[PDB]
Amino acid sequence: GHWSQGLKISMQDPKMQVYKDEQVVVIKDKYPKAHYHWLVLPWTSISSLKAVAREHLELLKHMHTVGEKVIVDFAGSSKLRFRLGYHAIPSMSHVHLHVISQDFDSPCLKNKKHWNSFNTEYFLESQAVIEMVQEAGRVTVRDGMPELLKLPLRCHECQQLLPSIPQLKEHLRKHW
DNA sequence: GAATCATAAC
Ligand SMILES: Nc1ncnc2c1ncn2[C@@H]1O[C@H](COP(=O)(O)O)[C@@H](O)[C@H]1O
Ligand SMILES: [Zn+2]
Structure with missing residues (x-):
């Protein structure tokens, strides 16, 4: 019932399921940070990246392909x-x-945390995670993630530094 | 005046 269990409720709601198969289910992100923003979840829940083991390798690859x-x-x-x-x-x-x-x-x-959560090392590429599991049997998340979320705003397409969210949104129109 | 940051949500 917690706000933090919201993904489990949504993925069980037939009207929220964009796609589903034997292993995973896709839902729209409820608060999308871009035009297209989906979340892919396994039916068999993984508690956290720390709990990921070599036994999940095939599932992580399947989530990526889906x-x-x-x-x-x-x-x-x-x-x-x-x-x-x-x-x-x-x-x-x-x-x-x-x-x-x-x-x-x-x-x-709406804020710097949103931006940096998709545009710093806080965002762990799916391909990079699959390789970590495929090679070490575990996902290593490096220390210092909270500080990355406070970095000054930088455009992901041209690396220009922007002083605020409104000016970043205005800058992004140059990359239409 | 607008935007961000820090903190709470009973
Ligand atoms: N009930 C929900 N259904 C779908 N997406 C959600 C829901 N609640 C929160 N979200 C999104 O799920 C993501 C959770 O962020 P994070 O835990 O950092 O991966 C955010 O992008 C939210 O917009
Ligand atoms: Zn740019």
């Missing part, structure tokens, strides 16, 4: 670039893969 399928099935006309990844220190329970388009045009993207 994310890419959803892009094709639902975002083909946009021509947007996408990234797939995990937040190093999530707030919502149940490990979930972010699948998010790189326009970052959304009213829900």
Whole structure:
């Protein structure tokens, strides 16, 4: 019932399921940080990245392939670039893969923490995580994630530094 | 005046 269990409730709601198969389910991010923003969750929950082991390798690969399928099935006309990844220190329970388009045009993207959670090392690429599991049997999340969320705003396309969220949103129009 | 930061949510 906690706010932090929200993903489990949503993924069980038939009207919220964008796609589902034997292993995973896709829901829209309720507070999307870009035009296209999905979350991929396994039916068998993973508590956290620390609990990930070599036994999850195939599932993590399946979550990745399902994310890419959803892009094709639902975002083909946009021509947007996408990234797939995990937040190093999530707030919502149940490990979930972010699948998010790189326009970052959304009213829900409101503050520096939002921006840096998709545009610093706090965002762990899905491919990088799969390789970590495939090679070490575990996901290593490096120390100091909270500080990355406070970094000054930097455009992800041209690396220009911006002083505020409104000016960043205005700057992003140059990359239409 | 606008935007951000720090803190709480019973
Ligand atoms: N009930 C919900 N259904 C879908 N997405 C949600 C829900 N509650 C929160 N979210 C999103 O889930 C993500 C949780 O962030 P994080 O824990 O950092 O991976 C955020 O991007 C939220 O916008
Ligand atoms: Zn730029």
